[PDB]
């Protein structure tokens, strides 16, 4: 009766914005990346790849409510670096890692299929 459709887990409705940056003024050099229609799948990898960055002083994600489909990532950096740049670098490193993983997986499949 009040069941949400199964596609609001992942589909942006018209006018919803995929990611918004909010520079919180509570502490210097921090941002709040509010990502819509995402879950722990991207929040956790982005958070951990941000934690590999030595110029990132804080990195954490949260789902404010599991019945809503929204990820809040909070990144704080050293002052000679910006949270937006940290987020972009984290996504590039995740993409390069997954590309390498896919290519090595194809190589391993081709090796085992032949023998």
């Amino acid at each position: 009766m009040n069941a949400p459709p199964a596609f609001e887990s992942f589909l942006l409705f018209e006018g919803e914005k995929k990611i918004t940056i909010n520079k919180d003024t509570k502490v210097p050099n921090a941002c709040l990346f509010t990502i819509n229609k995402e879950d722990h799948t991207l929040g956790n990898i982005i958070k951990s790849q941000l934690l590999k960055d030595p110029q990132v002083l804080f990195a954490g994600y949260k789902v404010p409510h599991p019945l809503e489909h929204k990820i809040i990532i909070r990144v704080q950096t050293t002052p000679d670096y910006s949270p937006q740049e940290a987020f972009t670098n984290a996504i590039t490193d995740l993409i390069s890692e997954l590309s390498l993983l896919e290519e090595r997986f194809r190589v391993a499949i081709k090796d085992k299929q032949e023998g």
Partner: protein
Amino acid sequence: NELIGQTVRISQGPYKGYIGVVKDATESTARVELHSTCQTISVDRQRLTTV
């Protein structure tokens, strides 16, 4: 308003392929009870196909 009571098919949007009978209609919005699920949704009339 001839749309009310007619079996209708949603042709655009996330509900594409859902069938139902219109309950109440405006010039731009209809209340279509879905045949597939147990809901009466609101859908823009550009995304509806009568049959």
